[PDB]
Design a protein around this ligand. Structure first.
Ligand SMILES: CC1(C)S[C@@H]2[C@H](NC(=O)Cc3ccccc3)C(=O)N2[C@H]1C(=O)O
Ligand SMILES: CC1(C)S[C@@H]2[C@H](NC(=O)Cc3ccccc3)C(=O)N2[C@H]1C(=O)O
Ligand SMILES: CC1(C)S[C@@H]2[C@H](NC(=O)Cc3ccccc3)C(=O)N2[C@H]1C(=O)O
Ligand SMILES: CC1(C)S[C@@H]2[C@H](NC(=O)Cc3ccccc3)C(=O)N2[C@H]1C(=O)O
Length: 262
């Protein structure tokens, strides 16, 4: 138990919920874990794996990202800020990837999942890049039920941090695809209250948030601290009551503890 792990435990104790953290510091490859091997519901953070899998497919199909996908009225689900504008029209796979990542559009995520052959296709890509933990079992919006003890649509902080590192800083994707993914993450619109609220302003980052039932509040990020090699940070948080409120502040607090511990 490290000093940082002790502060994370204190934060968790005061939060009432269950906190999972995984940091990889690429300056030396060291890691900091808190419940790093416990499973948590991914919710929207799973959108990174789906977009990355489509990017992988695009490496052998130069026109894939320009394929027009039909958006029908019935395709709309619970949260579709971008897709709703294109009902009875089409969106390209690039448009669907950007909407899923940067706006957390659920209809867009469902189109990425369908392009991959269903939730199992997203899981297959994860296995192909060495992630033996990740599992996607359902489409949107049910993949966000986040029921405690339910293994569906979960991963561990350790696994997600390693995967995010390989996707954004490593060679799991071709260079062009890696750059596209990083560009999309850096352009996220939903993350200012989460991990990034706990980092010094000078630091830059890309992230993908997630939210679900049980007050599930998640964020995964790739960070470029001022004058330091990048970090990869995963912060997952879930609560005992189905109707619990979101706690993005708890993710900010975890990130702050990690940053001050550097
Ligand atoms: C924008 C959101 C807050 S909502 C969207 C998706 N989750 C859901 O659609 C399900 C949900 C269930 C209960 C409470 C919030 C969201 C998901 O995850 N999303 C969040 C995000 O990207 O941070
Ligand atoms: C149903 C589809 C697979 S077809 C349309 C678009 N597909 C293409 O651009 C090439 C293609 C044509 C026929 C069958 C598969 C792929 C694309 O992607 N679309 C999918 C959709 O609308 O849901
Ligand atoms: C492409 C890779 C297989 S290589 C990189 C990392 N593996 C290593 O860094 C192995 C290594 C050990 C010591 C010195 C240099 C490289 C790791 O895992 N990475 C994968 C990735 O980037 O997606
Ligand atoms: C110091 C570096 C040359 S290495 C560090 C990071 N690169 C990686 O994390 C590559 C990698 C990906 C997956 C697994 C292992 C290594 C990255 O980018 N970093 C460079 C930097 O900050 O200048």
């Amino acid at each position: 138990t490290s000093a940082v792990q002790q502060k994370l435990a204190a934060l968790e104790k005061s939060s009432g919920g269950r906190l999972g953290v995984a940091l990889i510091d690429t300056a030396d490859n060291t890691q900091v874990l808190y419940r790093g091997d416990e499973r948590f519901p991914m919710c929207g953070t799973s959108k990174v794996m789906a977009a990355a899998a489509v990017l992988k497919q695009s490496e052998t199909q130069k026109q894939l990202l320009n394929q027009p996908v039909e958006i029908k009225p019935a395709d709309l689900v619970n949260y579709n800020p971008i897709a709703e504008k294109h009902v009875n029209g089409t969106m390209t796979l690039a448009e669907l990837s950007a909407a899923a990542l940067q706006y957390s559009d659920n209809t867009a995520m469902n189109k990425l999942i369908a392009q991959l052959g269903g939730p199992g296709g997203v899981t297959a890509f994860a296995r192909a890049i060495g992630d033996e933990t990740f599992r996607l079992d359902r489409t949107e919006p049910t993949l966000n039920t986040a029921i405690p003890g339910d293994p569906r649509d979960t991963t561990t902080p350790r696994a997600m941090a390693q995967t995010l590192r390989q996707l954004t800083l490593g060679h799991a994707l071709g260079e062009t695809q890696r750059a596209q993914l990083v560009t999309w993450l850096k352009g996220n619109t939903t993350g200012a209250a989460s991990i990034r609220a706990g980092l010094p302003t000078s630091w830059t980052a890309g992230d993908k948030t997630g939210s679900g039932d049980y007050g599930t509040t998640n964020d995964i990020a790739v960070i470029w601290p001022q004058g330091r090699a990048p970090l990869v940070l995963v912060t997952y948080f879930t609560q005992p009551q189905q109707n619990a409120e979101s706690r993005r502040d708890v993710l900010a607090s975890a990130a702050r503890i990690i940053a001050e511990g550097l």
